[PDB]
Every structure is written in C-alpha cells, then in structure tokens.
Ligand binder design. Structure first.
Ligand code: HEM
Ligand code: HEM
Ligand SMILES: [Zn+2]
Lengths: 416, 414
C-alpha cells in the first residue's frame, strides 16, 4: 500500500497513513537496530551552545524552508512577495551572517513550534496563542517587566490564556538572553541536614543558585522562588515576583474534609522558561511560554512522584489504607483522591484546568484535524498517555508516529 | 554507539551494550520512531514454501549453537566443534537442520528472556518445556495441549510452560493453532452489531461455528480449539470443562459486585505466535505463565472494545457519570482491579498485581545489566495500563531491540 507509516487505532479499528513525517529534516535518536523513543533527553535536538557563527549555508537552507512554510501558510507560495522575501533573507545573511523575522513570521513560527511539539497533549489549542514580541528587550530589568506582564495577561485572574514572550535571538560572539529557572513559578527545594528535602526536590539546584546570588531563603514547603534573569554577557540578576501576581490554589477534597488540613497547594500557571524556540535556523534562547494545567501533572506527577513531593503514603495513611502490601492497591486509591482534590480545588477557585479524560478526547480530535490538514501529527506516545488510568483514555489505543518538525521547541544546556 | 540509559527516579545511569548483538531490524529510522505500533508492517514471517538461503540459515544456526555452548560453559570444547559440524552437514545436504532437546529447552527460555514486551521476565529461568516435535496429527496436538493445560494450571498453583510442535518445513504447510489463546471466551455478533461475550474473539468464534461448533449464548462461553496439521483443514476440539479453571469475580467489600456475574480464566496461554530458534521456526508453540491483575481488571474488562464494564460498575457504585472530572472511570477501574486480586487470592489461583510485578522487573533489569550488559524492553508495554507513574518502570528509560531466539507474530492461517 502507501509507502508511509500505517497507523492504527485499536479501539475503533481505523487506519491512517502519516505522510507528514516525509517533511522532517532533523534526525531523531532511533535506528533500525534499536528504538530509543523512551529516552527523555536523547543527544539529538539538544541545542548545545554553538558560540561561533553557524554555517551560513546551513542557516540559509533552514531560513528558506521556513520562509517557504510561511508563504505557504498565507497561500502566496511562488508569488513576487515570496521570492522577494527569500532574496531579502539571503542578502541579510550574506552581509551580516544572520537575519531577522518580520512580526507576522514570528507569530506564525511560535504557533507552529507548539503545533509541532510531539510531547504536548494540549495541541488542539495551538491556533490560540498570544505572542508577545519582546525582541526590543535590552536588560535583565526589562526582561522582568515583560515576564510580569506575561504572567498577568496569561493568568487573567483564573481564566488562563496561552501565551509566549519572545526575547532577542542569539547572535555570534555575544551572550544569550536566558531565564535560569525552568519555569516562571517553582517551589524552593531546601536540602536538609539529614540529606532529605523540604519543598520540591526537583528544584534543589536552582534554589541553591538563587541563594548563591543573594536570595534569602525561607523554610517552607511551598516557597515561590525568585527569578534569575540574564541579559547578554552579564551575570544573572535576581528578581522577586510580587505575591499578588502568583496565583495559587489551596488544595481541598470534595468529601474528605481532612485533606485541606494537609496544607497542600499548587500554582495556577504552568510556564516553561528554559527551552529554546527555533525558527528558520534562528535561535530564541529566552522565550517563556505558558498554557494551563492538565490535572494529572499536579495530582499525579508533582505530588506523587517518589522524587517529587511523594505524598502517596501520607494520604493513604489518612485514608486508613493497608500500606503494608501492594495488593491492597493503596497507591492507586490515594492517587485517585489526590487527583480529584486538584480538580475540585481548581474548579472551586475558578482557575482553568483540564482533566486527563477531557484532554485526551480533545487530543484525539486534534489528531483528526491534523490528519486532514497536514497528513499526520508527530506524537510521543509515552508523554501523551496520562500517568494514571492510561488505557481508560482514548490515546492509549492510538498508535503514534514520532518525528521532529521545525519550527520547534528544544531543550538547551543550562547557562551555568 | 551505546545508548546511555537513565532512571529519573534514582538518577542512576547505565549503558546498553547488548543492543550491539541485534541482527534483526525494528520499524524505526532516524527520520521517525514507530515504537508505539503493535504489529510490524514488514517484520512479519513470510511463507516457507521454499528453503531459506543456506548461508543465512547457517549463520543463524552457528550463532545459536555458539550461544548454547557458552551457556553450559563448554565453548570451544570438542562437543561444541562437533555440533557445529553436524549442523553444517545437515544444512548443506538438506537445506535445514534439527535441534537437540537440550538446545530447544535453552532456546525457549532465551526467547522469553529476549521478549521486550514482557514484564514478568524475572521468571525466565523457570519454564517447563514440553517437546512435542513427534506430533503428526491435530488429534495428537489436542492431547499435548490438554496435558500442557493440566500441568500449567496445577490446581491453581500455576507453573510456566511451553509446548513445542513440529518446526516449519519448505513447501509443506505449518502445524498451527488457530486460536490466539488456549482459553478464549466467545464473542457473538447480534442483531444490531452489538456483541455478547468478548468482542476481541468475534472472528475466531465464527470460524469455530463454521467448522461445526454448536454455539452457546452466554458472556463467558469457553471456545473450542481449532487445531491444524500440515495442509489439512483445521479440526475442532472441545476442551474438557474440568481442565479450564475459572475464577468467579467478587469484591472484598462491595456486596453487589458478585451480582454482575463476571469471571475470568486462570490460565493465560498465547498460542498464535512463532518461536524462532537458530533460524528454525516453530509455528505452533503455545506458552503460558500467570496473569498480572491489570490484564484482566483493566484491559480485558474495561477496554472500550472489550467487555467495557466501566459504566455498569460506576452506576452500581452510584458515581457521578455526568462528567469526566468526577473521575468515575478511575474510581471504578481501581475497584474492578481490586476485585480481580481479591477473587484470585480467594480461589487460591496465582496472580500478581502491577506494583509487585514492576518491582520484580526492575530487579530483572539490574540482573540483566550485570549478566548481558542490557535488556531489551518496550516501555509502552512494560508500564501498566493504570497508575503508570505510581510504578518504578515508568521512570526508567528503556532500549528496545530484537534479539534471537525470539517470539514473533505470524500471519493468521485463514
Ligand atoms: C493550553 C494548555 C496546555 C495543556 C493542557 C498542555 C499540556 C501538556 C502536558 C500534559 C505536557 C507534558 C508535561 C510533562 O509530562 O512534563 C505538555 C508538554 C509540552 N507542551 Fe503543552 N500544553 C498546553 C499548552 C502549551 C503551550 C501554550 C505550549 C507552547 C506554546 C506548549 C508546549 C509544550 C511542549 C514543548 C511540551 C514538552 C516540554 C518538555 O519536553 O518538557 N504546551 N503540554
Ligand atoms: C510468569 C508470569 C508472566 C507474567 C506475569 C507475564 C506478563 C506479561 C504481560 C503483562 C504482558 C503484556 C500483555 C498485553 O498487554 O497484551 C506479557 C507479554 C508477553 N510475555 Fe509475559 N508474562 C509471564 C510469562 C510469560 C511466559 C511463560 C512467556 C514465554 C515463555 C512470556 C512471553 C511474553 C511475550 C512474547 C509477550 C508479548 C506478547 C505479545 O506481543 O502480544 N510471558 N507478559
Ligand atoms: Zn523508536
């Protein structure tokens, strides 16, 4: 049949062929000999800091592909404007070694990067992204201003709006604009004398970096961390987010009245700030983006991972479950109630959130839309299927093809 | 060259060097990963009307023989040398060769050990191997199969086993078991497309009927076996009821669960896969172990295209099925899995929960890292269908590749 990957949905028995993968221009980590699809950070995309200017011949090809993508999106491929733009880009790279995007090209590129993200289950929303152009930013202080405005706009008192703020692109010999923190909102992780951790263990390194840079630490379990912002060729500067700007939700349970006594909580805005946005070969090292949470991220991963808050046993004990044996399914029961508490609480506080059932059903719609629009959709099964009740959702039974398309969001090395 | 493998829960790292011994290609390429696909597009097992290239077969045979003698610490011995000559001599003159029982036993265990989708491999060394290569008819296949079932069931104290029927031969038809498993519940299509029983077994149910079976009309009617000897139409055999151990499902605290009339068989025995050892192919080699509770409680009973009982259980529990956010599906699923564990435990039938199973698999990974420098594993199949990240394997990166001896899918015989 068709010389493309055949994809089956085992629930419905339907079949599709992915032809979009034919457009991938960047190799992944797999080979016919072995599959490395489960690796979180395979040395592939990894945007290792490439100081010296990038080969003009390579950048040019990437730039042309992106410009072609842009003109195709507005249905003017081959037009005079299309060829003239191509000429402009080639001329700008010729005399300067790099080039710059027009406003509309950046908006298109940022949305495409999200659309192309294989690990994102919320892509049905890809067309609705507020793109803040901060390419005029010239200092760490100004970065903070842009970031605070982003947070205010995106949070919108609980009715969250997806958004991305784009700071100046990378340039040869010159330092990068960087946000040291992995997310705009992170809870401190304080190493204890006995080796344990109070707070979020995932943030021990950034917490210590903040202290090394003048931050006076607290001693709580949910202390919001300050931001370490870095402008070109300068040491990072510390900035404390005004409390009124960081919306949080105290967690309570719909029927278990004691759950609220646990003093648990989480912040409303998920905003990734350490990834690199790549568009037409241009690299935006500082381009924080945010959406809204799927409840399992908080209730299952953040609160129950053994290496995170690890609250499973505490909650199970409160529920008076038999934690001495696996067959009682105490972990399963506790996790369900914790996830329900997250949903209930966000709903009570009128803060946007989506449960894993609703999110996956919407992602299935997205796959259908994309099959028609582009002939496929790059998707990472291991990241799309939720961390709890996997097979109870539709995506579990849907085979997926994973590949890299650009524009794209990529991991990049830590600045320190 | 060698992939770095990290466990995100513990921060530990290892390097898989075993993957270098892989000689068979998977479906992935640097351009795109097809790791989530269930069946191969090409990695199938094409017909065998003609003898496989002597050179290819010979290289596979030698490699296997080398594996075998290394396992008994007699590599380079006189026995090793002479065995290689025997294989060389038989292939050169006949285009094929035959395994010794001791080698078949080693090969079967290795095939299990190499299965990337199996989370129960810590048990790989404990496998009862029944040599059924002296079988010449469907009737004899039935006798062997019944004996396999009796031994494996063991009154509830399940024991892993495999029965190996005659290997495939050039230009001759294969010995085959048409059913995907030795124990399967019928799936009867009714008036308006709906299905009574197991929807996964509609096609096989109809085949049985077409071949003379008198169909029942229940939700859990055990199907008869369609056994096929070379180039003969399949023959129908009804398994003696006393040989098929079943477990009535009830819940530890929910009195009404038993009223649902749910049940499941004790013995999971895959019968439609091919066992490949040293280039030889065994088209009929049913193998069995014991169930992990999620297979029954989550997939078999809750999959939308299976018994799909989630909503019935939810209503009996008086849950709010009005919206997804009440997590009624999650609550119902947990209780259903608890009922499975409780019931099997009560009936004294071997079963393992997903937490205990994954912990043992993590031990297996460590054991294999020391013994062979790695372990092929398919993440999507190792991580349980419920409570994925609540188990250790979720946080463990895995490398998937094909090693031989191996169990592989093959075309349906009809
Ligand atoms: C509208 C709400 C959104 C929802 C519910 C959603 C949900 C998710 C989830 C559940 C993950 C996996 C998280 C993990 O397991 O670590 C994810 C990953 C991702 N999402 Fe979305 N997303 C949304 C918005 C966005 C936006 C606005 C962007 C970018 C413009 C985006 C870009 C990505 C990327 C690049 C990843 C992978 C990051 C990584 O590899 O760590 N998402 N998303
Ligand atoms: C002793 C207890 C055992 C347990 C608890 C166990 C558990 C499992 C589970 C949970 C699966 C995935 C099932 C699915 O999702 O469809 C599986 C697959 C598999 N197991 Fe094991 N296993 C055991 C014994 C065996 C034995 C005895 C063999 C072979 C001699 C074996 C060979 C395999 C193979 C080849 C697969 C993949 C089958 C397929 O592709 O559909 N397992 N096992
Ligand atoms: Zn792969």
């Amino acid at each position: 049949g068709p010389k493309f990957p055949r994809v089956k949905n085992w629930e419905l028995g339907s079949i599709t062929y992915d032809t979009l993968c034919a457009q991938s221009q960047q190799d992944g980590p797999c080979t016919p000999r072995r599959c490395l699809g489960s690796l979180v950070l395979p040395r592939k995309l990894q945007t290792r800091p490439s100081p010296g200017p990038p080969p003009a011949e390579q950048l040019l090809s990437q730039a042309r592909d992106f410009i072609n993508q842009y003109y195709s999106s507005i249905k003017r491929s081959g037009s005079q404007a299309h060829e003239e733009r191509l000429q402009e880009v080639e001329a700008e790279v010729a005399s300067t070694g790099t080039y710059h995007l027009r406003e509309s090209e950046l908006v298109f590129g940022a949305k495409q990067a999200w659309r192309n993200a294989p690990r994102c289950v919320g892509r049905i929303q890809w067309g609705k992204l507020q793109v803040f152009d901060a390419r005029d930013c010239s200092s760490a202080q100004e970065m903070f201003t842009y970031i605070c405005n982003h947070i205010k706009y995106a949070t919108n008192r609980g009715n969250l709006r997806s958004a991305i703020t784009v700071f100046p692109q990378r340039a040869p010999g010159r330092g990068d604009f960087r946000i040291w923190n992995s997310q705009l909102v992170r809870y401190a992780g304080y190493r204890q004398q006995d080796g344990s951790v109070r707070g979020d263990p995932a943030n021990v390194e950034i917490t210590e970096l903040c202290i090394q840079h003048g931050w006076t630490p607290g001693n709580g379990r949910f202390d919001v961390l300050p931001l370490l912002l870095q402008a070109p060729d300068e040491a990072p500067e510390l900035f404390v987010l005004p409390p009124e700007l960081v919306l949080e939700v105290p967690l309570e349970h719909p029927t278990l009245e004691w759950f609220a006594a646990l003093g648990l909580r989480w912040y409303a805005l998920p905003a990734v700030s350490n990834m690199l946005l790549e568009i037409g070969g241009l690299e935006f090292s500082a381009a924080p983006f945010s959406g809204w949470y799927m409840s399992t991220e908080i209730g299952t991963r953040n609160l129950c991972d053994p290496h995170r808050y690890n609250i499973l046993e505490d909650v199970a004990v409160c529920m008076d479950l038999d934690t001495r044996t696996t067959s009682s399914l105490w972990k399963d029961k506790a996790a369900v109630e914790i996830n329900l508490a997250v949903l209930h609480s966000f709903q009570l506080a009128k803060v946007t959130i989506v449960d894993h059932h609703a999110a996956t059903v919407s992602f299935m719609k997205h796959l259908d839309n994309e099959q028609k629009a582009r002939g496929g959709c790059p998707a990472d099964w291991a990241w799309i299927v939720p961390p709890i009740s996997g097979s109870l959702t539709p995506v579990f039974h849907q085979e997926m093809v994973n590949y890299i398309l650009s524009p794209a969001f990529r991991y990049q090395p830590d600045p320190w």
